[PDB]
Design a protein around this ligand. Structure first.
Ligand SMILES: Nc1ncnc2c1ncn2[C@@H]1O[C@H](COP(=O)(O)OP(=O)(O)NP(=O)(O)O)[C@@H](O)[C@H]1O
Ligand SMILES: [Ca+2]
Length: 419
């Protein structure tokens, strides 16, 4: 019909992606109505990777913005909002240099303002935003905010919502509806969506994204072993120590050292275990690092690097991961492969290949020791990256919020029929 459009640039730690969304101009407040029209993946690094060359951050966006001009009808350009939101790459850069951060944001802002779209700003999202908006995305797309039943016979309990686990490159988020009392205001979220209240727990672990965890494990391996037990036997590389220790995530842990793998699953497990501090909890219950967390409950979607890693274990290693024990076994087996054994499973490009043992191990420990999934609760986790032909992430939920497309109440309160 008469369609409206909106554009979000997702400026992550390791990449920028552009999403174009579209929806009917007159059904626009219905849940699940907005869908993904197109997307584009910016070549090269995330915007924070241009900390020392900020004008390039803007320029990196140009090819995808030219695509947006083709993707969105010209008569709609002027009224199509365009947002850029940045995540943990930029949060980390702000810790190093607020000035470099400001310049990168100035540069993207300058570039986006040249385009005919209604540009509504480039902002850095908080960890909370990032978590909650991915949770809104998943549940919006799946129509979990619908009030199921009919007059005089409403389903009770209300339709459950899908928890969200996001494993990015520099941070990781966990978000789910909970009935538990909140013990920490920084974790407590209250939403009013379609006349309903959702009590939500969220937390973002900075430095617990995939790329930063790989750096911490490398730093740890260099310090403890002078070999890398999580790398496969026969794999070695020259490590630039400058790069290992420049991150805020590792600076608390001979310009070049050779480092070789040893396919040692048990020492890998030991190395990964040190990532999680379970020694104190100022609350009734914690995940790890003294962070409050109520018991995990309900179904969960695990996307981003949770998905990519499970996809590798299932599709490439050909291993089942339906249970925590299976995931643990799949990890041991992956970790015990030699570099030649591993490469033979991957006829094509091998970027990331040596790191799968470490990431799978981290994921297993994060879920079981960090979040305290057990067999019963893990049965309710699904690994997917797409719902209703839309990429799952925080971008849709962010656009929904900023365009005010999710009503707090239904029109006229649906005559009070949901009271
Ligand atoms: N297609 C892929 N296959 C395997 N791994 C991938 C793929 N795409 C991205 N990754 C890796 O998975 C991790 C998470 O990717 P992504 O979710 O894009 O992070 P991000 O948004 O750049 N980081 P953050 O700012 O912390 O959310 C990164 O370490 C990527 O290198
Ligand atoms: Ca991300």
């Amino acid at each position: 019909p008469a369609l409206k459009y909106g554009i979000v640039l997702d400026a992550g730690s390791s990449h920028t992606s552009m999403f174009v969304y579209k929806w009917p101009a007159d059904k626009e407040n219905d849940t699940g109505i907005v869908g993904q029209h197109s997307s584009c993946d910016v070549q090269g690094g995330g915007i924070s990777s241009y900390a020392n060359d900020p004008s390039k951050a803007g320029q990196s966006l140009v090819r995808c913005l030219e695509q947006a001009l083709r993707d969105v009808p010209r008569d709609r350009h002027a009224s199509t909002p365009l947002y850029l939101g940045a995540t943990a790459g930029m949060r980390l850069l702000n810790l190093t240099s607020p000035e470099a951060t400001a310049r990168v944001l100035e540069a993207v802002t300058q570039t986006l303002t040249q385009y005919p779209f209604d540009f509504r700003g480039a902002r850095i999202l908080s960890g909370q935003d990032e978590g909650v908006f991915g949770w809104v995305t998943a549940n919006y797309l799946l129509e979990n905010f619908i009030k199921y039943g009919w007059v005089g016979r409403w389903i009770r309990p209300r339709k459950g919502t899908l928890g969200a686990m996001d494993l990015g490159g520099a941070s990781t988020q966990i978000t789910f509806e909970t009935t538990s009392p909140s013990e920490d205001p920084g974790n407590e979220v209250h939403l009013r969506l379609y006349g309903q209240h959702y009590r939500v727990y969220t937390h973002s672990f900075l430095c617990y994204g995939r790329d930063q965890i790989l750096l911490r494990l490398l730093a740890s391996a260099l310090q403890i072993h002078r070999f890398h037990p999580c790398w496969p036997k026969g794999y070695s590389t020259q490590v630039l120590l400058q790069e290992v220790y420049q991150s805020p995530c590792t600076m608390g842990q001979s310009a070049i050292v050779s480092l070789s793998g040893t396919s040692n699953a048990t020492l890998c497990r030991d190395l990964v275990s040190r990532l999680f501090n379970i020694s104190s909890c100022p609350f009734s219950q914690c995940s790890f690092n003294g962070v409050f967390q109520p018991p995990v409950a309900g179904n969960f979607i695990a996307f981003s690097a949770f998905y990519y890693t499970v996809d590798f274990l299932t599709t490439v290693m050909g291993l089942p991961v339906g249970t925590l024990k299976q995931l643990e076994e799949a990890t041991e087996i992956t970790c015990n492969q030699t570099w030649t054994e591993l490469q033979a499973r991957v006829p094509g490009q091998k970027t990331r290949l040596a790191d799968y043992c470490a990431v799978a191990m981290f994921i297993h420990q994060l879920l079981s020791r960090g979040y305290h999934f057990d067999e019963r609760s893990f049965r309710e986790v699904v690994f997917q990256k797409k719902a209703a032909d839309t990429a799952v992430g925080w971008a849709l939920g962010y656009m929904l919020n900023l365009t005010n497309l999710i009503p707090a109440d239904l029109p006229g309160l649906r005559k009070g029929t949901h009271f």
